[PDB]
Amino acid sequence: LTLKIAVYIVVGLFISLFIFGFLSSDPTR
Amino acid sequence: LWEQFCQWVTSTNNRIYVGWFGTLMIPTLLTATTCFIIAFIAAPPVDIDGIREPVAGSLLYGNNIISGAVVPSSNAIGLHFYPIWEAASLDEWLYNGGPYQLVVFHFLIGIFCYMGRQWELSYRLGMRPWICVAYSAPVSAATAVFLIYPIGQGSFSDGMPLGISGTFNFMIVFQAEHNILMHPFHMLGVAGVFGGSLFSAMHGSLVTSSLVNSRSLHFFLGAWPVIGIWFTAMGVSTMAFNLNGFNFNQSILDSQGRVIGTWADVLNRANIGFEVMHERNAHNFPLDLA
Amino acid sequence: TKFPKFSQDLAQDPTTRRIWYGIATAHDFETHDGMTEENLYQKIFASHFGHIAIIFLWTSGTLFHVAWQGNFEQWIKDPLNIRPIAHAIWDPHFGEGAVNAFTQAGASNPVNIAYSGVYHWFYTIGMTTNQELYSGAVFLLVLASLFLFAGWLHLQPKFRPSLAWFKNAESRLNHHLAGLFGVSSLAWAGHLVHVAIPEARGQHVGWDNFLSTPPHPAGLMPFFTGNWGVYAADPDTAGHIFGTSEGAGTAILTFLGGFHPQTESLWLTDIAHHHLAIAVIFIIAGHMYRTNWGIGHSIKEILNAHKGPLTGAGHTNLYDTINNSLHFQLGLALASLGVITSLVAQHMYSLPSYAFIAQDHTTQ
Amino acid sequence: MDGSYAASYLPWILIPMVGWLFPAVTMGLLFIHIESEGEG
Amino acid sequence: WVIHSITIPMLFIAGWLFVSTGLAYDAFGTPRPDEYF
Amino acid sequence: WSGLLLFPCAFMALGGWLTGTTFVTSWYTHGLASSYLEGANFLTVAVSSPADAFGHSLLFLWGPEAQGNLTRWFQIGGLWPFVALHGAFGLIGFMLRQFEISRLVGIRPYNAIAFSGPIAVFVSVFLMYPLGQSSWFFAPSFGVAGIFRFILFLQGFHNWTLNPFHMMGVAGILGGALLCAIHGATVENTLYSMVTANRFWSQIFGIAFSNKRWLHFFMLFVPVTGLWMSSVGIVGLALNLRAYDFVSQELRAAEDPEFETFYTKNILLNEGMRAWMA
Amino acid sequence: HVPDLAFNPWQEIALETDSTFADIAFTEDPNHGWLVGTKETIFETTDGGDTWEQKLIDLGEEKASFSAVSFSGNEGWITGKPSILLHTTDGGQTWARIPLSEKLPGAPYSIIALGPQTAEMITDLGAIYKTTNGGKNWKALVEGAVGVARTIQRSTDGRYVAVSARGNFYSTWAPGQTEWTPHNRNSSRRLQTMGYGKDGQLWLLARGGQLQFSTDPDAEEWSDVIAPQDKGSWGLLDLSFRTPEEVWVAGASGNLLMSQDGGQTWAKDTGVEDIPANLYRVVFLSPEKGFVLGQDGILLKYN
Amino acid sequence: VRWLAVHTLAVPSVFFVGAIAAMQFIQR
Amino acid sequence: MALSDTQILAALVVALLPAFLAFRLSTELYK
Ligand code: CLA
Ligand code: CLA
Ligand code: CLA
Ligand code: CLA
Ligand SMILES: C=Cc1c(C)c2cc3nc(c4c5[nH]c(cc6nc(cc1[nH]2)C(C)=C6CC)c(C)c5C(=O)[C@@H]4C(=O)OC)[C@@H](CCC(=O)OC/C=C(\C)CCC[C@H](C)CCC[C@H](C)CCCC(C)C)[C@@H]3C
Ligand SMILES: CC1=C(/C=C/C(C)=C\C=C\C(C)=C/C=C/C=C(C)/C=C/C=C(C)/C=C/C2=C(C)C(=O)CCC2(C)C)C(C)(C)CCC1
Ligand SMILES: [Fe+2]
Numbered sequence A: 001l002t003l004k005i006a007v008y009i010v011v012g013l014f015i016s017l018f019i020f021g022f023l024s025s026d027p028t029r
Numbered sequence B: 001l002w003e004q005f006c007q008w009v010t011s012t013n014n015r016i017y018v019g020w021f022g023t024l025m026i027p028t029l030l031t032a033t034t035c036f037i038i039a040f041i042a043a044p045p046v047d048i049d050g051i052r053e054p055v056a057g058s059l060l061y062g063n064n065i066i067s068g069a070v071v072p073s074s075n076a077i078g079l080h081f082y083p084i085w086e087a088a089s090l091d092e093w094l095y096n097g098g099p100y101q102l103v104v105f106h107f108l109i110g111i112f113c114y115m116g117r118q119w120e121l122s123y124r125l126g127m128r129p130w131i132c133v134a135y136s137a138p139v140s141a142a143t144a145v146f147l148i149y150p151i152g153q154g155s156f157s158d159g160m161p162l163g164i165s166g167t168f169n170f171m172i173v174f175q176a177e178h179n180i181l182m183h184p185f186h187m188l189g190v191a192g193v194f195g196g197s198l199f200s201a202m203h204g205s206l207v208t209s210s211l212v213n214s215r216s217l218h219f220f221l222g223a224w225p226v227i228g229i230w231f232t233a234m235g236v237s238t239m240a241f242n243l244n245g246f247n248f249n250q251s252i253l254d255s256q257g258r259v260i261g262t263w264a265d266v267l268n269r270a271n272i273g274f275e276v277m278h279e280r281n282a283h284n285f286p287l288d289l290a
Numbered sequence C: 001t002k003f004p005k006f007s008q009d010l011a012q013d014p015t016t017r018r019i020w021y022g023i024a025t026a027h028d029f030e031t032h033d034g035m036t037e038e039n040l041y042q043k044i045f046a047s048h049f050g051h052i053a054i055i056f057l058w059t060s061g062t063l064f065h066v067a068w069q070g071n072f073e074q075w076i077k078d079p080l081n082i083r084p085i086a087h088a089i090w091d092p093h094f095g096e097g098a099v100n101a102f103t104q105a106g107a108s109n110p111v112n113i114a115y116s117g118v119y120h121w122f123y124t125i126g127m128t129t130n131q132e133l134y135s136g137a138v139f140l141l142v143l144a145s146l147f148l149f150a151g152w153l154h155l156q157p158k159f160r161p162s163l164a165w166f167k168n169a170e171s172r173l174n175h176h177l178a179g180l181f182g183v184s185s186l187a188w189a190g191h192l193v194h195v196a197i198p199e200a201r202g203q204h205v206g207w208d209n210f211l212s213t214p215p216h217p218a219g220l221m222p223f224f225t226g227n228w229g230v231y232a233a234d235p236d237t238a239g240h241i242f243g244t245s246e247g248a249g250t251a252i253l254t255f256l257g258g259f260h261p262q263t264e265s266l267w268l269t270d271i272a273h274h275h276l277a278i279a280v281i282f283i284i285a286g287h288m289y290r291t292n293w294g295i296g297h298s299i300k301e302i303l304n305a306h307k308g309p310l311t312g313a314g315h316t317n318l319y320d321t322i323n324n325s326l327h328f329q330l331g332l333a334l335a336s337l338g339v340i341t342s343l344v345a346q347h348m349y350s351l352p353s354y355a356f357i358a359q360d361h362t363t364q
Numbered sequence D: 001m002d003g004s005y006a007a008s009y010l011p012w013i014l015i016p017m018v019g020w021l022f023p024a025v026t027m028g029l030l031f032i033h034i035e036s037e038g039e040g
Numbered sequence E: 001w002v003i004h005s006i007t008i009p010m011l012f013i014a015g016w017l018f019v020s021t022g023l024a025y026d027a028f029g030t031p032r033p034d035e036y037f
Numbered sequence F: 001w002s003g004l005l006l007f008p009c010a011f012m013a014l015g016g017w018l019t020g021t022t023f024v025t026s027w028y029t030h031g032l033a034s035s036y037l038e039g040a041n042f043l044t045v046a047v048s049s050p051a052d053a054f055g056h057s058l059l060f061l062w063g064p065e066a067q068g069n070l071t072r073w074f075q076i077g078g079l080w081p082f083v084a085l086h087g088a089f090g091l092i093g094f095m096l097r098q099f100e101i102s103r104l105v106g107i108r109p110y111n112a113i114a115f116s117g118p119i120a121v122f123v124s125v126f127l128m129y130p131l132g133q134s135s136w137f138f139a140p141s142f143g144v145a146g147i148f149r150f151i152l153f154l155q156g157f158h159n160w161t162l163n164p165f166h167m168m169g170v171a172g173i174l175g176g177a178l179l180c181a182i183h184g185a186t187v188e189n190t191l192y193s194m195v196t197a198n199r200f201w202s203q204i205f206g207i208a209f210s211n212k213r214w215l216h217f218f219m220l221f222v223p224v225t226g227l228w229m230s231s232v233g234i235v236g237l238a239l240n241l242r243a244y245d246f247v248s249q250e251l252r253a254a255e256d257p258e259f260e261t262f263y264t265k266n267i268l269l270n271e272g273m274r275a276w277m278a
Numbered sequence G: 001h002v003p004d005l006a007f008n009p010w011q012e013i014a015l016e017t018d019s020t021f022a023d024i025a026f027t028e029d030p031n032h033g034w035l036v037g038t039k040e041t042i043f044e045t046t047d048g049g050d051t052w053e054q055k056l057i058d059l060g061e062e063k064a065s066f067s068a069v070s071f072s073g074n075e076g077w078i079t080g081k082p083s084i085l086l087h088t089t090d091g092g093q094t095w096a097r098i099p100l101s102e103k104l105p106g107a108p109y110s111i112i113a114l115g116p117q118t119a120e121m122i123t124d125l126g127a128i129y130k131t132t133n134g135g136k137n138w139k140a141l142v143e144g145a146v147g148v149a150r151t152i153q154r155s156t157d158g159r160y161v162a163v164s165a166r167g168n169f170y171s172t173w174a175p176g177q178t179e180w181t182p183h184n185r186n187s188s189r190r191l192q193t194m195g196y197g198k199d200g201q202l203w204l205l206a207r208g209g210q211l212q213f214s215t216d217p218d219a220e221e222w223s224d225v226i227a228p229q230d231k232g233s234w235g236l237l238d239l240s241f242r243t244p245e246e247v248w249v250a251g252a253s254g255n256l257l258m259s260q261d262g263g264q265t266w267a268k269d270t271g272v273e274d275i276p277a278n279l280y281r282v283v284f285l286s287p288e289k290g291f292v293l294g295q296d297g298i299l300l301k302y303n
Numbered sequence H: 001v002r003w004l005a006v007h008t009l010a011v012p013s014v015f016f017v018g019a020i021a022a023m024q025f026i027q028r
Numbered sequence I: 001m002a003l004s005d006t007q008i009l010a011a012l013v014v015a016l017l018p019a020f021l022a023f024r025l026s027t028e029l030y031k
Helices: A002-024 B002-010 B019-042 B090-095 B098-124 B131-153 B165-178 B184-210 B214-240 B263-275 C017-024 C037-069 C096-102 C118-125 C130-153 C169-200 C221-225 C228-232 C268-285 C299-305 C318-324 C326-350 D010-034 E007-020 E024-028 F006-022 F070-075 F079-105 F110-132 F145-158 F164-189 F194-204 F212-238 F247-255 F262-275 H002-026 I005-030
Strands: G010-014 G021-026 G033-037 G042-045 G053-055 G065-072 G075-081 G084-088 G108-115 G118-123 G128-131 G138-142 G152-154 G160-163 G169-173 G181-184 G191-196 G202-206 G211-213 G238-241 G247-250 G256-259 G281-284 G290-293 G298-302
Touching: A002 B002, A002 B019, A002 C221, B002 B019, B019 B098, B090 B098, B098 B131, B098 F194, B131 B214, B131 F164, B165 B263, B165 F262, B184 B214, B184 F110, B184 F164, B184 F212, B214 F164, B263 F145, B263 F262, C037 C118, C037 C130, C037 I005, C118 C169, C130 I005, C169 C268, C169 C299, C221 C228, C299 C318, C318 C326, E007 H002, E024 F070, F006 F079, F006 H002, F079 F110, F110 F212, F145 F262, F164 F212, F247 F262, G021 G281, G021 G290, G033 G065, G033 G075, G033 G290, G075 G108, G108 G152, G152 G191, G160 G191, G169 G191, G191 G238, G202 G238, G247 G281
Parallel strands: G021 G065, G065 G108, G238 G281
Antiparallel strands: G010 G298, G021 G033, G033 G042, G042 G053, G065 G075, G075 G084, G108 G118, G118 G128, G128 G138, G152 G160, G160 G169, G169 G181, G191 G202, G202 G211, G238 G247, G247 G256, G281 G290, G290 G298
């Protein structure tokens, strides 16, 4: 069951970075 | 450190633009590529049909590039989500065609994020974002043939096999059980692609000759195949819910009612033949054997 | 005699009354010969598809005739001095005097004068050229074709809905409240923000360039970060001239209230915030009834729970009564629609929404 | 009886059909159908 | 209008009568529903 | 010259089609109602192939066939060779017209070589394949459903998908459509301005087009290449077949119930189609 | 989540083989029984299936996948594709190979022993034969072909049904006819399997586990679509009748579900859900003697 | 020269459409 | 600008399709 948690945190942090980056970029938004 | 990372991500001075959509495009695309290569090399045989007739499409199991493919998930799976952690063991996942689902899902997310990165870069550079509009049609077609059709049919095994021979087999069975040729939307897609190739040839020849409204003409010519692919994707998605093509068989009757039959009946006969790969009854099988 | 096929009592009548009553009881599907509930519901479904397609065709015809024989492009240059034109006149029975009398509104032929007030509506929603009207008419033709084909399709044996599908109140209410009402209102607000307001402020925006023209200078940043007030700053000043960039603000959602000083109508940004807010409220309302996830209310228990010591049984068993009776539902819908239509009239003569429509007294 | 709109000749042929041809055609078709004693 | 007022209208009913009875079937050899076996 | 010879014959090539789809049947040749006169709709109607009893006969009206009888010339199915010949000569007239127009303008006749693709496709599918076949009966019909039936018949009897030439033709058609769409989008998105589009494509894909010359050249030469490869595949079909036949995999799957391939299933489908009509 | 079965009446045995188990058969209750499967694997028990011993056998070609095993009295038959038949009358102590004639249409699929020296041969291509000389002579009851059939099921009284090569339609045959009657599928989704219930009616499993039951002898109309796993989209693989009322269904990843009401409500047997195998066939020889054949040498025994 | 270039297809067209219109009732 | 003759003719041709679909729907509803 460790694999499920591993992939879960991987995708969670990936989408967290994806949603944070758009807020970071001030130009063109 | 975060600010420099964001600046490098959004920078247009980089060798290859990544974009914040790229932060999701790269992992999904790389996962799809890696798992696709692994399955195409050493995938264990998969019982797609659900009977005691396993099918193996890997190269290590005696296949070439033309015949090799990635077998869709087992018919016992259906539409159920089948990740690795939901399997009792890795062998169970391998024998149930899970790599197909993994590759398909990560690759679909990757192409969606490719759309996102395309739009993001077009907006950052200030260029008009119509390249994504054109790119929608192949993406819509891929989603229809990889996701919409399995959902409509109630099984992931009905999707397009990831290969060359599997593609032809899928097209043949699709025609057999759906009559896609008689459907007006495959007709519209065929018209769109043929017209697009025609326009490409005309304009390439004209430019080559001239090489030692124009904008309206260029845009309409470019939009023609995009519209055609949109229509064919719509047709495949409608087919997925059993909205089959035109069935003109059994139509024309004579004075006393006897069926005359047209070429539509011949197409129906061909479809039935591709449906069952042998002869019908009353064909004098051997009466006795030793 | 064959007609009417649905009643053998009328078909055997030797008199001409069979011709009359056959028309009268034609669309009374309940009393037809050998009618079952499932067939009744499916036929009603197809007929409703047909009425929808007819409505779309009628709207398309209005648009097409206005675009073809009207003076829309001339009318927008002077809405307070040019009569809108409904359709051209072609009457061979006319004489010279009638031809001279009816050649009005600057036309070069006999023509009518529109009083439906659709020129003001088309001007307000954004469309300003004849090609836009023509495109709208063609699109509505296509929509009518799609709905007619849908009515044909959901009549085939492989697509005929089951009786249990029709009697699903909770799912119908959820979808028709969150989706039919909320999503349509949200889309209309998006149309007003993305197209109508910039067009009314002079900036031309259409299908060709709406993908590269942000409705607001700050795109999706204040909305997502919670700083919504950014979208209400710099509204349209009192000196704004409709359709031009003189006195035009940049706010896309305001709460100005009152009327535009020039058009004597409501501000477009007010309409945007209004339809957006009601869209949000309707989307919230559409998540109330339990369909397939356990959560949500069930209408039967709510009705049966609101009893009372004075009324006796209260609202018990009303769910079955309303669900199993199409006439009860039709009466409820008709009463609600009549009240809403009265409200539309009363709140529309006093609160005009279209530009320069309060000065056209005949249309009002 | 002329108009300045595009394709002014259309009402010259469309209105008669909607005025005479279509009404008479459906009139006769419906009259035949309602008196059709073939079945009931 | 004079040269076209007669040429067009007659041919429609001409074709209607030509195909309404046993002329086209014998002309092009396409069997009638009776001749079909 | 060639400017006013293509127009008449092609008209007849057109004309015999409509009367070939509304009045003349195939009950004596194919046993089907291939005419509208029986009530067949637009998709169902066609111009049926001639009966196989005449072999490769040109089916001239004045000639020994039909002995000059027009009704016989209809019932023998001479309309198919009639239409095929007239259409082929109309196509060659169009080719010559393009050549002479290019000569008059003086530009290099790249449009002629661009249109050479469809010329080859038509002269191979509807003229050469029946020549290499037994008779005109196996030739494709002139209609909607007839073309689909011909396609399915070729799939059954030749494994046409596995032929590398139809693979190249599919690749050419899809690449031509891709280049057309990308060209339209690029032209209407840069509104020359080539350098910024090159930069955009470099940052998106990795490489771009140095010149509009190369892009236009490639979109000109992709679909014509696909068409020419498909025509060459038809050439090979008439002659000894050449497809990537994997007899070893077939042998392995013949006796091993645990070995199966998509190629093996395609073979099973092909012989299944080939089995149950004669 | 579907309701979970509280009690597990199935005991799991993990045989040390990777051969998928196809069929089981018995002679007498206190007597030996046999099971046949893939890769020329045959297992014989004598205590009622509690323990098994492997029988090893090799031929000139090592690609004999056994499909059916049928025992009547002391006579036994084992049929596998490609064509291979092993017949005996000694309880399987020694097996006589019957070299099938070349003119047999299609690889054999199933065999039923109608008693001593009586057997019926079913071929995947639809051909049906009858042998009464212990394989020496065959007789064709039907002289027709149905094409490639995914699954063929035999009714209690000898009637045969066969799903098409892809589940588009099906073909039915009854004794007394020389042809097979084709019939269109009665479910919107494409068919996966079809069988005859012990009540005498037919049951169809479509794609995505859409179980449907039939009523009346013609059974042209069918009952409402029933999904034993509700939101679960697992595709079921077999349906079995322990009793004409209680029903069992077997699917993937050990998804074994049971209905105490004949299909109206279904409980998930989480006791066998942990099994790392794909259950294939649940056979109920008796209401107490039942066997679930899956994959990778995993079996379930009733108690 | 456009006179014939139109009439050569105009005459057969009007000849045929009348028959096609009559066609929907002859088979009835 | 004002419309063109081809625009009106194309509108008529497009409107031909809903006519056919409505004919089919009416015939189906008559059953
Ligand atoms: C004259 C013959 C002819 C022609 C021209 C066509 C033409 C077409 N058919 Mg068709 N067909 C025919 C005969 C024909 N058919 C016959 C006879 C049959 C019966 C067997 C069929 C059965 C049939 C089926 C069953 C289907 C078609 C489909 C199609 C369309 C394919 C478009 C496509 O792939 O989507 C566009 C391209 C894609 C979706 C590919 C994915 C593109 C993504 C976006 C990019 C992927 C990149 C990749 C990862 C590699 C990257 C490279 C590098 C950067 C790493 C097209 C309109 C398909 C369709 O309608 O599509 C919806 C379809 O499903 N046909
Ligand atoms: C002899 C008297 C007479 C006649 C015959 C007409 C005839 C006409 N006038 Mg007219 N007119 C008249 C006097 C007359 N006018 C007078 C005195 C004035 C005042 C000066 C006008 C002012 C006038 C204007 C201002 C206009 C006309 C227009 C028209 C045309 C409308 C087209 C039409 O009817 O199709 C449409 C047909 C209908 C709407 C049918 C409606 C009536 C039926 C009965 C309703 C259907 C009921 C039922 C469902 C039918 C079932 C089906 C049926 C087949 C059985 C038509 C040619 C219009 C025009 O030229 O534009 C086209 C227009 O704009 N007229
Ligand atoms: C998101 C999902 C969705 C959507 C969009 C719809 C949409 C629709 N359904 Mg529906 N339906 C759904 C799910 C959905 N359904 C489900 C899940 C079920 C099964 C439980 C059904 C079962 C069902 C049945 C049984 C029927 C429908 C019907 C209809 C149509 C009725 C016409 C209508 O209300 O529009 C017009 C009305 C509006 C758009 C809103 C009303 C106007 C508001 C209240 C006030 C006015 C606003 C504004 C001021 C006016 C505009 C002014 C402007 C012109 C200037 C409509 C298109 C009927 C039909 O036959 O249609 C084909 C029908 O009989 N539905
Ligand atoms: C319901 C909508 C509607 C209505 C009431 C009208 C009304 C009119 N049109 Mg018009 N039109 C419409 C839609 C409509 N149009 C659309 C959508 C088109 C595009 C195809 C046209 C194209 C058109 C042309 C080209 C011409 C007219 C003309 C006319 C006038 C002559 C009468 C007539 O219609 O017959 C003639 C017109 C037609 C037969 C057009 C077809 C009608 C549409 C396409 C179908 C409507 C079906 C309708 C919903 C059926 C309702 C059923 C109900 C009775 C139970 C009249 C003012 C004529 C005119 O201007 O004369 C002055 C003329 O020449 N129309
Ligand atoms: C879908 C296939 C297809 C069709 C139908 C088609 C058609 C056409 N392309 C033309 C041009 C071209 N085609 C080009 C590239 C291409 N064209 C392609 C594919 C096609 N091109 C492809 C794939 C390419 C890329 C290589 C170029 C570069 C040109 C041109 O220069 C030219 C143009 O400018 O376009 C407008 C026109 C030739 C006019 C002519 O010869 O006048 C004479 C007309 C004759 C002789 C009639 C043909 C008679 C035929 C053979 C028999 C009768 C046909 C029946 C009516 C229908 C039967 C068909 C059944 C399936 C129903 C015509 C509109
Ligand atoms: C999706 C989506 C995205 C991008 C969306 C983009 C880029 C565009 C979206 C456009 C959409 C979503 C809808 C457009 C709808 C238009 C409609 C529905 C028109 C209907 C018209 C009717 C019904 C009636 C028309 C009329 C006409 C024509 C008239 O002329 C008279 C008035 C009237 C009668 C009203 C992204 C991924 C970024 C985020 C997630 C959401
Ligand atoms: Fe170009």
